[PDB]
Structure 1
């Protein structure tokens, strides 16, 4: 019913964020299911390094933004308290 999405950059960062979310979820109760990791979006693009004649000189940059989400079957007052201690109704 109530889907709480979250995003981060580092793998350990999104892991500890989802760990804190699932810990306060087990605190509030209401039978919260575990975190749902989703495949990250890789935003790659090549950039010429020098402003003059060199075409083999191009770097490779990687963007790995971790996007996960958790679900709530029924919103209650304790769940909204744990909220106000991305949202989709």
Structure 2
């Protein structure tokens, strides 16, 4: 828009509660896809998004898995003649560190809502909390 621009855009209401926040020591995001190029583009979007919000991120590529199975090519007899099929799974692991519970929800929503078709995520949150108050003091 050249001349016609919003004046005071409405922004969502964020209210700070009195409950303490979760503390995630680690947060591993394992994305899976049949296509390597899609993971490269998603890895760029996720690393850029993390860096813009202040999150610390690292990336590595777990070894790919190829599952192969054999089928019978003909409809009837001709046993020795087969057709083989495979499904390839490729992985990109985004290991985040030192996240509060509010930072991990907004980030995961933003990147989960933009998860391309054919891509599956496996978030593995690792929370750190104090000891139970009963355990803190031995009681007989």
- The interval holding the TM-score normalised by the smaller chain is 0.7 to 0.9
Corresponding residue number in structure 1 for 2:69? 45
Is 1:70 the equivalent of 2:106? no
TM-score, scaled relative to structure 1: 0.84
Alignment length (residue pairs): 88
Deviation at 1:79, TM superposition (A): 4.0
Is 1:88 the equivalent of 2:114? no
Superposition CA RMSD, Å: 1.5
- 1:16 and 1:57 map into 2 onto residues whose CA distance is 40
List aligned pairs for 1:1-89, cutoff 5 A. Answer: 1-33=26-58, 35-76=59-100, 77-85=102-110, 86-89=122-125
**Partner SS state of residue 56, structure 2:** coil
Runs of 4+ in 1 over 4 A off after TM superposition: none
Q: Which runs of 5+ in 1 are unaligned?
A: none
**Partner SS state of residue 47, structure 2:** helix
User: Is the Cα contact below 8 Å between 1:41 and 1:65 reproduced in 2?
Assistant: yes
TM-score, scaled relative to structure 2: 0.57
Deviations along 1:22-65, one digit per CA (max 9) or x if unpaired, are 111111223222x2111122110010011212123211212111
